[PDB]
Structure 1
Amino acid sequence: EIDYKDIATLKNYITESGKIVPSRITGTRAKYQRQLARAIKRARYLSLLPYTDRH
């Protein structure tokens, strides 16, 4: 149920520089971590999330 349009939820799993946080830090399952990575990449494409802190 992870949606790339849920930026409020996706921002909890990215650092201050926009990088995805590892599953060891947030303690999320591997399956939902993969879903989160896919959703974050899609949201980066739609310019809803930044690729980096620069641009």
Structure 2
Amino acid sequence: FCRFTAEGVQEIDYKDIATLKNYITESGKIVPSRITGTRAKYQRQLARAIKRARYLSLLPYTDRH
């Protein structure tokens, strides 16, 4: 649950998509922090990074484009 991003403290980067694809649903929606367990600080950086990879077409806005 709470584990990832708290050990090996790092700032969520929008470039690496493998880490980002873990935190989205089957339709490109960001997964709530209640489910994954990411801390409230790193969810804000995480969400802001997913909204940045979508702009560059690295990630889908929705599964129906």
Identity of aligned residues (%): 100
**Aligned-pair RMSD on alpha carbons?**
0.5
Runs of 4+ in structure 1 over 2 Å off: none
Alpha-carbon distance between aligned partners in 2 of 1:36 and 1:54, rounded to the nearest angstrom: 23
Which 5+ residue runs of structure 1 have no aligned equivalent?
A: none
TM-score (norm 1): 0.97
Higher helix share: 1
Aligned pair count reads: 55
Which 5+ residue runs of structure 2 have no aligned equivalent?
A: 1-10
TM-score (norm 2): 0.82
Query: How far 1:22 sits from its partner (Å)?
Result: 0.1
